[PDB]
Amino acid sequence: RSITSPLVAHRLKPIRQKTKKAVVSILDSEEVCVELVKEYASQEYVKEVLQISSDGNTITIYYPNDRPPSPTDNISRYSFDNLPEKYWRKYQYASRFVQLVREKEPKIEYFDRYAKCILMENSPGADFEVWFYDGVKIHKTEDFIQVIEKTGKSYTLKSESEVNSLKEEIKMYMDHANEGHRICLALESIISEEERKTRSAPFFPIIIGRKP
Amino acid sequence: RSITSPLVAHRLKPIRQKTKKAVVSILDSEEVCVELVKEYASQEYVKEVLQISSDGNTITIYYPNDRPPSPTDNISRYSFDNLPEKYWRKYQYASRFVQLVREKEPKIEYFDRYAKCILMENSPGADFEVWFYDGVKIHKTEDFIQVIEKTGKSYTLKSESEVNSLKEEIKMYMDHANEGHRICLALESIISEEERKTRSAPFFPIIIGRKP
Q: How far apart are CA A74 and CA A63, in angstroms?
A: 6
Residues in CB range of B16: below 8 A, 6 or more apart: B23, B25, B66, B67
Pairing, β B45-52 against β B75-79: unpaired
Same-domain check for residues B116 and B211 = yes
Same-domain check for residues A198 and A147 = yes
Task: Of B60, B57, B56, give the one whose Cα is nearest residue B48.
Answer: B60
Query: Across A53-193, where does the E strand assignment appear?
Result: 58-62, 75-79, 106-111, 115-120, 128-132, 137-140, 145-148, 154-157
- Residue A144's domain spans which residues? 106-212
Q: How many domains is chain B built from?
A: 2
Same-domain check for residues B28 and B100 = yes
CATH number assigned to the domain comprising residue B76: 3.30.1120.120
How many of the other CB atoms lie within 10 Å of CB of A67? 6
Of B179, B202, B208, the CB nearest to A203: B208
Q: Which residues of B touch A (CB under 8 A)?
A: 110-113, 179, 183, 186-187, 190-191, 194, 198, 200-210
Distances (CA, A) of B91 to A61, A94, B22, B57, B86: 71, 63, 12, 11, 10
The residue of chain B with its CA nearest to that of A181 is B200
> A206 vs B207: CB contact, 8 Å cut-off?
yes
3-state secondary structure of A58: strand
Determine the distance in angstroms separating the CA of B33 from the nearest CA of chain A, rounded to an integer: 22
Same-domain check for residues B79 and B122 = no
Q: How far apart are CA A162 and CA B74, in angstroms?
A: 56
The residue of chain B with its CA nearest to that of A108 is B208
What phi and psi, each to the nearest 5 degrees, are found at residue B95?
-60, -50
Domain end, chosen from B79, B105, B131, is at B105
3-state secondary structure of A109: strand
Residues in CB range of B171: below 8 A, 6 or more apart: none
**Burial status of residue A63 (CB atoms within 10 A of its CB: 0-12, 13-18, 19 or more):** middle
Residues in CB range of B26: below 8 A, 6 or more apart: B9, B12, B13, B14, B15, B32, B98, B101
Determine the distance in angstroms separating the CA of B8 from the nearest CA of chain A, rounded to an integer: 18
Q: How far apart are CA B149 and CA B167, in angstroms?
A: 12
CATH number assigned to the domain comprising residue A149: 3.30.1120.130
Q: How far apart are CA B188 and CA A23, in angstroms?
A: 43
Q: At what angle do helices B168-195 and A168-195 cross, to 10 degrees?
A: 140
Same-domain check for residues B101 and B158 = no
Same-domain check for residues B54 and B23 = yes
Q: How far apart are CA A115 and CA A179, in angstroms?
A: 11
Q: What DSSP element (H or E) covers A160?
A: none
Q: How far apart are CA A167 and CA A69, in angstroms?
A: 56
Which residues from A are below 8 Å from B207, CB to CB?
A: 206-207
The residue of chain A with its CA nearest to that of B117 is A201
CA torsion sign for B39, B41, B43, B48 is negative
Instruction: Give the number of C-alpha atoms closer than 13 A to the C-alpha of residue B198, restricted to the C-beta side.
Output: 20
Q: How far apart are CA B55 and CA B12, in angstroms?
A: 12
Experimental method reported for this structure: X-ray
How many of the other CB atoms lie within 10 Å of CB of A46? 15
Domain end, chosen from A70, A88, A105, is at A105
Q: How far apart are CA B17 and CA B35, in angstroms?
A: 10
Pairing, β A206-208 against β A106-111: parallel
Yes or no: say if B124 and B133 are a contact pair by the CB < 8 Å rule.
Answer: no
Residues in CB range of B124: below 8 A, 6 or more apart: none
Task: Of A53, A5, A59, A60, give the one whose Cα is nearest residue A31.
Answer: A53
Instruction: Give the number of C-alpha atoms closer than 13 A to the C-alpha of residue B135, restricted to the C-beta side.
Output: 6
Same-domain check for residues A136 and A209 = yes
Same-domain check for residues B211 and B110 = yes
Determine the distance in angstroms separating the CA of B196 from the nearest CA of chain A, rounded to an integer: 12
Yes or no: say if B136 and B146 are a contact pair by the CB < 8 Å rule.
Answer: no
Q: What is the DSSP letter of A139?
A: E
Beta bridge partners of B120: B106
Same-domain check for residues A94 and A188 = no
- What stretches of B69-205 show up as alpha helix (H) in DSSP? 88-102, 160-163, 168-195
Q: How far apart are CA A67 and CA A159, in angstroms?
A: 44
Domain end, chosen from B73, B105, B137, is at B105
Q: How far apart are CA A6 and CA B150, in angstroms?
A: 43
Q: Peptide bond before B124: cis, by omega within 30 degrees of 0?
A: yes
> B204 vs A207: CB contact, 8 Å cut-off?
no
Q: How far apart are CA B158 and CA B164, in angstroms?
A: 11
Same-domain check for residues B20 and B81 = yes
3-state secondary structure of A64: coil
How many of the other CB atoms lie within 10 Å of CB of B114? 19
> A209 vs B201: CB contact, 8 Å cut-off?
yes
Q: What is the DSSP letter of B178?
A: H
Same-domain check for residues B93 and B124 = no
3-state secondary structure of A95: helix
Same-domain check for residues A18 and A70 = yes
